[model samples]
Target: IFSTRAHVFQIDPNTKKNWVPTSKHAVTVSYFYDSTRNVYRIISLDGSKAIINSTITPNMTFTKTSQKFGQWADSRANTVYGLGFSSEHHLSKFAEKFQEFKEA
Candidate 1:
């Protein structure tokens, strides 16, 4: 697996209506690969207080709703993870890698 970077936002658990800025600036995010049953996992460094660790799935997708923000649910219908992009290209790059991994 490879890695990417972006600012992180998580769906507010209590509000469920706002994007909580987990990182003020772009942080590194990575896709992990291993042979143990092909389990899916994602990890990111959003400064010091936040991270995204989930069991990603092949059926999942990153759906963009704004120019600077996009989000995806944990495909298995558990939760939403939002991302803050520095540019449209950054989001596109993220999606391309995401799609590639999902399809693999």
Candidate 2:
């Protein structure tokens, strides 16, 4: 509830398998501490639907798939969520924050 977002996308059905962006722009994605759950969560929204909602775990990993994009899979949620940043610096900073929450 505190912070949240994602540039939602869907893969092309054709052979190209292009990652077709669902949204026109990159959406805000934020990390917030969940007092009730006793864990940090990454929450994102597009309209009323939540595209990226994950409970951070110590073993969870935020992987830099590219310079401006990253992804992590949650075993509990059974989903893989992605994030797109404005630049490497933003991406780098978020990853650092991910570690911070994961260890807490």
Candidate 3:
């Protein structure tokens, strides 16, 4: 079991626009990815956890296979993409990707 810290952000949909700059709080979680076994695993910010033990295609892309959670704050219209600890440092990037998804 791996333990790590991460930040969680949610976007506000009613800021006279969509995918605007809005963030909640930072959360911590434990995560693990077994490349050899092709498994993706993660836990909640509060220590609660879940795991996925399965096989993956050899050429699977990381960004495509990475687990992503939708941002409920955006009315499910936009998706806030989180990646490891980078979520805290890359809010704009996340928002951009979310907007792209929203437009698509």
All models: lDDT? 0.75, 0.72, 0.36
lDDT of 2 by residue, 1-104 (tens): 33323465544446434566656777777788889978789876778877667888878998888887777767776556666777877778888888888888
Residue 58 local lDDT, model 3: 34
Greater-TM-score candidate between 1 and 2: 1
Range of the 10 consecutive residues with the lowest summed lDDT in candidate 3: 49-58
Question: How many clashes in each structure?
Answer: 0, 1, 0
Candidate 1 lDDT, tens digit per residue, 1-104?
77777788778778778878777778888778756957656787654643787666767778877776778887443568898777888788777777777777
Give the C-alpha miss distance for residue 43 in model 1, angstroms: 0.9
> Candidate 3 regions off by >4 Å?
10-24, 32-38, 46-78, 83-104
In order of TM-score, best first, we have 1, 2, 3
Per-residue alpha-carbon lDDT of candidate 3 for residues 1-104, written as tens digits (9 for 90 to 100): 44444354333336633433222334544334566755543334434422212122233222322333333222223333233344333433443443343332
Q: Model 1: which residue pairs collide?
A: none
Model 3 quality (TM-score): 0.29
State TM-scores per candidate: 0.79, 0.77, 0.29
Pick the lDDT winner: 1
